[PDB]
Amino acid sequence: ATFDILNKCTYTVWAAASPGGGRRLDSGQSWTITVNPGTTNARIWGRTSCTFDANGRGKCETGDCNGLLECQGYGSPPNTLAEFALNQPNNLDYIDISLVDGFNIPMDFSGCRGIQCSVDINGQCPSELKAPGGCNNPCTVFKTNEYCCTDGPGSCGPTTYSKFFKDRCPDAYSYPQDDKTSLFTCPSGTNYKVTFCP
């Protein structure tokens, strides 16, 4: 599938993708990439307040991926995530927005359907979760089963912290096993758009 990633934010967002790399997107700028069929574990995100040298090495305030402009792996929370797995059994793509790795930039992720998390989550973030330039999931900050779901299927459920996210962005994953209301499919052959600050 092709993904068009567009920055509508008034500030620069350094877009990233696993797999795909990364690009500086000033306001209004787009980057289009191809992710091949069968790819799983994939994600697109944006990074805020980056500094990079002439070789693309540096650091971002949110979503940094091992200090590279061109990501070769996942970023550091908090980062709003567009997650996808392509061309899975029965020709289904599995898509979602996740806040399980935190929020940093409001996002729209569209394909056969539009999913959005566009609220001022940073401005309303609980003091327990606040991070420079974003809002961490409780699981990232507090390493307990109640937030992280490590103890098996059904061992965790919504918490006052997951609900902070879920009340505001009902369609995104708010805790690791938030599947029934956050996991979507599109028929395979769909193409996608990720928009920052929709």
mmCIF file of C-alpha atoms in Angstrom:
data_model
loop_
_atom_site.group_PDB
_atom_site.id
_atom_site.type_symbol
_atom_site.label_atom_id
_atom_site.label_comp_id
_atom_site.label_asym_id
_atom_site.label_seq_id
_atom_site.Cartn_x
_atom_site.Cartn_y
_atom_site.Cartn_z
ATOM 1 C CA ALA A 1 0.000 0.000 0.000
ATOM 2 C CA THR A 2 0.965 3.657 -0.491
ATOM 3 C CA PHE A 3 0.764 6.061 2.480
ATOM 4 C CA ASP A 4 0.608 9.862 2.006
ATOM 5 C CA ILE A 5 1.819 11.543 5.170
ATOM 6 C CA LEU A 6 0.938 15.219 5.381
ATOM 7 C CA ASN A 7 1.821 17.791 8.013
ATOM 8 C CA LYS A 8 -1.003 20.340 8.564
ATOM 9 C CA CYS A 9 0.483 21.557 11.886
ATOM 10 C CA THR A 10 1.698 25.124 12.196
ATOM 11 C CA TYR A 11 5.027 23.664 13.498
ATOM 12 C CA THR A 12 7.596 21.387 11.815
ATOM 13 C CA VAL A 13 7.050 17.615 12.356
ATOM 14 C CA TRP A 14 9.739 15.190 11.509
ATOM 15 C CA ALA A 15 7.695 12.332 10.083
ATOM 16 C CA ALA A 16 8.986 8.750 10.690
ATOM 17 C CA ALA A 17 8.060 5.232 9.496
ATOM 18 C CA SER A 18 9.008 1.693 10.311
ATOM 19 C CA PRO A 19 9.720 0.645 7.658
ATOM 20 C CA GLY A 20 10.378 3.756 5.552
ATOM 21 C CA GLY A 21 12.758 6.067 7.368
ATOM 22 C CA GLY A 22 11.956 9.730 8.036
ATOM 23 C CA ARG A 23 11.597 13.269 6.699
ATOM 24 C CA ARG A 24 11.433 16.817 7.893
ATOM 25 C CA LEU A 25 7.910 18.102 7.084
ATOM 26 C CA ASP A 26 7.558 21.813 7.561
ATOM 27 C CA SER A 27 4.055 23.129 7.664
ATOM 28 C CA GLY A 28 1.976 21.917 4.646
ATOM 29 C CA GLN A 29 4.647 19.440 3.410
ATOM 30 C CA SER A 30 3.969 15.745 2.484
ATOM 31 C CA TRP A 31 5.983 12.527 2.168
ATOM 32 C CA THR A 32 4.663 9.506 0.319
ATOM 33 C CA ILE A 33 5.932 6.026 0.883
ATOM 34 C CA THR A 34 5.237 2.443 -0.178
ATOM 35 C CA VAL A 35 4.950 -0.378 2.414
ATOM 36 C CA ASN A 36 4.853 -3.792 0.884
ATOM 37 C CA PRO A 37 2.105 -6.407 1.259
ATOM 38 C CA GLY A 38 2.619 -8.836 4.133
ATOM 39 C CA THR A 39 4.401 -6.194 6.331
ATOM 40 C CA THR A 40 3.381 -6.375 9.982
ATOM 41 C CA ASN A 41 4.563 -4.381 13.106
ATOM 42 C CA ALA A 42 4.562 -1.232 10.965
ATOM 43 C CA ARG A 43 3.922 2.271 12.170
ATOM 44 C CA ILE A 44 4.003 5.956 11.066
ATOM 45 C CA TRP A 45 4.517 8.761 13.563
ATOM 46 C CA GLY A 46 5.669 12.347 13.936
ATOM 47 C CA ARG A 47 8.442 13.766 16.088
ATOM 48 C CA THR A 48 8.583 17.247 17.605
ATOM 49 C CA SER A 49 11.519 19.617 18.334
ATOM 50 C CA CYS A 50 14.285 17.835 16.522
ATOM 51 C CA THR A 51 17.793 18.904 15.896
ATOM 52 C CA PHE A 52 19.891 17.077 13.151
ATOM 53 C CA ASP A 53 23.391 17.507 11.748
ATOM 54 C CA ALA A 54 24.411 17.251 8.115
ATOM 55 C CA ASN A 55 24.380 13.430 8.374
ATOM 56 C CA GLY A 56 20.991 13.144 9.865
ATOM 57 C CA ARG A 57 22.167 12.404 13.446
ATOM 58 C CA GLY A 58 20.715 14.274 16.355
ATOM 59 C CA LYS A 59 17.808 14.105 18.778
ATOM 60 C CA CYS A 60 14.046 14.780 18.913
ATOM 61 C CA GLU A 61 12.045 15.812 22.020
ATOM 62 C CA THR A 62 9.371 13.181 21.205
ATOM 63 C CA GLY A 63 9.421 10.021 19.091
ATOM 64 C CA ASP A 64 13.164 9.971 18.704
ATOM 65 C CA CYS A 65 14.399 6.839 16.914
ATOM 66 C CA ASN A 66 18.044 6.195 18.096
ATOM 67 C CA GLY A 67 18.988 9.855 17.231
ATOM 68 C CA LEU A 68 18.393 9.420 13.467
ATOM 69 C CA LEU A 69 16.509 11.559 10.979
ATOM 70 C CA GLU A 70 16.051 8.397 8.883
ATOM 71 C CA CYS A 71 14.398 5.890 11.391
ATOM 72 C CA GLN A 72 15.525 2.282 11.330
ATOM 73 C CA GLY A 73 13.289 1.295 14.248
ATOM 74 C CA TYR A 74 10.662 2.569 16.653
ATOM 75 C CA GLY A 75 10.639 5.886 18.383
ATOM 76 C CA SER A 76 10.742 6.892 22.092
ATOM 77 C CA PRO A 77 7.327 7.589 23.748
ATOM 78 C CA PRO A 78 5.313 9.714 23.883
ATOM 79 C CA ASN A 79 4.347 9.441 20.195
ATOM 80 C CA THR A 80 0.908 9.239 18.581
ATOM 81 C CA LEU A 81 1.060 6.074 16.398
ATOM 82 C CA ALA A 82 -0.643 5.077 13.074
ATOM 83 C CA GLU A 83 -0.121 1.281 13.234
ATOM 84 C CA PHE A 84 -0.770 -1.239 10.406
ATOM 85 C CA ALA A 85 -0.337 -4.850 9.284
ATOM 86 C CA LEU A 86 -0.902 -5.427 5.524
ATOM 87 C CA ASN A 87 -2.330 -8.291 3.511
ATOM 88 C CA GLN A 88 -2.973 -10.529 6.566
ATOM 89 C CA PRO A 89 -5.166 -13.749 6.262
ATOM 90 C CA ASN A 90 -8.311 -13.307 4.180
ATOM 91 C CA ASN A 91 -6.820 -10.268 2.414
ATOM 92 C CA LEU A 92 -7.319 -7.958 5.392
ATOM 93 C CA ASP A 93 -5.232 -4.988 6.499
ATOM 94 C CA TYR A 94 -5.325 -4.266 10.244
ATOM 95 C CA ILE A 95 -5.128 -0.648 11.134
ATOM 96 C CA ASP A 96 -5.317 1.606 14.180
ATOM 97 C CA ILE A 97 -4.239 4.711 15.996
ATOM 98 C CA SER A 98 -2.602 3.919 19.250
ATOM 99 C CA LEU A 99 -1.896 6.077 22.344
ATOM 100 C CA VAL A 100 -0.471 3.016 24.177
ATOM 101 C CA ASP A 101 2.951 4.588 23.444
ATOM 102 C CA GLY A 102 1.618 8.027 24.382
ATOM 103 C CA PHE A 103 0.400 11.117 22.496
ATOM 104 C CA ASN A 104 2.502 13.927 21.015
ATOM 105 C CA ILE A 105 0.728 15.237 17.905
ATOM 106 C CA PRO A 106 -2.933 15.122 16.884
ATOM 107 C CA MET A 107 -3.463 12.690 13.987
ATOM 108 C CA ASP A 108 -5.840 11.464 11.345
ATOM 109 C CA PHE A 109 -5.202 7.988 9.821
ATOM 110 C CA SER A 110 -7.462 7.232 6.924
ATOM 111 C CA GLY A 111 -7.803 4.350 4.579
ATOM 112 C CA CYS A 112 -11.220 2.693 3.948
ATOM 113 C CA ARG A 113 -12.347 4.632 7.033
ATOM 114 C CA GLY A 114 -11.147 7.773 8.869
ATOM 115 C CA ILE A 115 -9.761 7.374 12.380
ATOM 116 C CA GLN A 116 -8.787 10.488 14.268
ATOM 117 C CA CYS A 117 -7.289 11.669 17.548
ATOM 118 C CA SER A 118 -7.328 15.440 17.299
ATOM 119 C CA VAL A 119 -8.016 16.708 20.832
ATOM 120 C CA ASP A 120 -5.745 18.901 22.991
ATOM 121 C CA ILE A 121 -4.485 15.867 24.920
ATOM 122 C CA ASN A 122 -1.149 17.707 25.770
ATOM 123 C CA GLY A 123 -2.904 20.644 27.348
ATOM 124 C CA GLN A 124 -5.180 18.377 29.484
ATOM 125 C CA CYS A 125 -2.564 15.660 30.317
ATOM 126 C CA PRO A 126 -2.548 14.539 34.013
ATOM 127 C CA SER A 127 0.575 15.608 35.942
ATOM 128 C CA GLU A 128 1.434 11.930 36.445
ATOM 129 C CA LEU A 129 1.739 11.443 32.646
ATOM 130 C CA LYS A 130 3.198 14.755 31.456
ATOM 131 C CA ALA A 131 6.365 14.613 29.337
ATOM 132 C CA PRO A 132 8.089 17.352 27.396
ATOM 133 C CA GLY A 133 5.995 17.914 24.297
ATOM 134 C CA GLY A 134 3.461 15.099 24.948
ATOM 135 C CA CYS A 135 1.480 12.899 27.303
ATOM 136 C CA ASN A 136 2.719 9.372 28.172
ATOM 137 C CA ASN A 137 0.483 6.284 28.474
ATOM 138 C CA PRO A 138 0.477 5.099 32.142
ATOM 139 C CA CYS A 139 2.066 1.776 30.984
ATOM 140 C CA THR A 140 5.184 3.623 29.720
ATOM 141 C CA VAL A 141 5.622 5.504 33.057
ATOM 142 C CA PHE A 142 4.327 2.960 35.675
ATOM 143 C CA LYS A 143 5.389 -0.550 34.878
ATOM 144 C CA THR A 144 2.457 -2.527 36.356
ATOM 145 C CA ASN A 145 0.182 -5.164 34.992
ATOM 146 C CA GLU A 146 -2.917 -2.984 35.638
ATOM 147 C CA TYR A 147 -1.506 -0.604 32.888
ATOM 148 C CA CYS A 148 0.633 -2.904 30.743
ATOM 149 C CA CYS A 149 -1.441 -6.125 30.386
ATOM 150 C CA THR A 150 1.694 -8.373 30.704
ATOM 151 C CA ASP A 151 -0.106 -11.043 32.754
ATOM 152 C CA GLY A 152 -2.114 -12.486 29.804
ATOM 153 C CA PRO A 153 -5.413 -12.041 27.815
ATOM 154 C CA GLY A 154 -8.091 -10.325 29.980
ATOM 155 C CA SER A 155 -5.806 -9.601 32.980
ATOM 156 C CA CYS A 156 -6.143 -5.809 32.534
ATOM 157 C CA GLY A 157 -8.935 -3.408 31.648
ATOM 158 C CA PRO A 158 -9.594 0.348 31.379
ATOM 159 C CA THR A 159 -8.036 2.559 34.126
ATOM 160 C CA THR A 160 -8.637 6.169 35.152
ATOM 161 C CA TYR A 161 -5.474 6.950 33.058
ATOM 162 C CA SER A 162 -6.462 4.955 29.938
ATOM 163 C CA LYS A 163 -9.861 6.558 30.221
ATOM 164 C CA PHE A 164 -8.229 10.018 30.117
ATOM 165 C CA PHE A 165 -7.169 9.120 26.568
ATOM 166 C CA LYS A 166 -10.208 7.089 25.608
ATOM 167 C CA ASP A 167 -12.760 9.772 26.645
ATOM 168 C CA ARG A 168 -10.972 12.173 24.311
ATOM 169 C CA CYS A 169 -10.042 9.814 21.454
ATOM 170 C CA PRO A 170 -12.648 7.009 21.544
ATOM 171 C CA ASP A 171 -11.328 5.324 18.469
ATOM 172 C CA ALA A 172 -7.681 4.946 19.465
ATOM 173 C CA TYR A 173 -6.067 2.254 21.614
ATOM 174 C CA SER A 174 -5.886 3.648 25.177
ATOM 175 C CA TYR A 175 -4.361 0.510 26.873
ATOM 176 C CA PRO A 176 -2.702 -2.583 25.359
ATOM 177 C CA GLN A 177 -5.805 -4.790 25.172
ATOM 178 C CA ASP A 178 -8.247 -2.027 24.062
ATOM 179 C CA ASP A 179 -8.916 -4.104 20.810
ATOM 180 C CA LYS A 180 -12.718 -4.334 20.479
ATOM 181 C CA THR A 181 -13.080 -0.542 20.022
ATOM 182 C CA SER A 182 -9.698 0.378 18.486
ATOM 183 C CA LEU A 183 -8.773 -2.320 16.000
ATOM 184 C CA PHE A 184 -10.019 -1.821 12.450
ATOM 185 C CA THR A 185 -9.696 -3.631 9.190
ATOM 186 C CA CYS A 186 -9.620 -2.586 5.532
ATOM 187 C CA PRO A 187 -9.680 -4.873 2.608
ATOM 188 C CA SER A 188 -6.167 -5.325 1.266
ATOM 189 C CA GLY A 189 -5.375 -2.959 -1.754
ATOM 190 C CA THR A 190 -6.581 0.054 0.241
ATOM 191 C CA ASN A 191 -4.216 3.061 0.281
ATOM 192 C CA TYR A 192 -3.693 5.295 3.256
ATOM 193 C CA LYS A 193 -3.169 8.866 4.397
ATOM 194 C CA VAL A 194 -1.725 9.978 7.752
ATOM 195 C CA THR A 195 -2.364 13.627 8.555
ATOM 196 C CA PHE A 196 -0.696 15.581 11.494
ATOM 197 C CA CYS A 197 -2.951 18.275 13.018
ATOM 198 C CA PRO A 198 -6.022 17.323 10.892
#
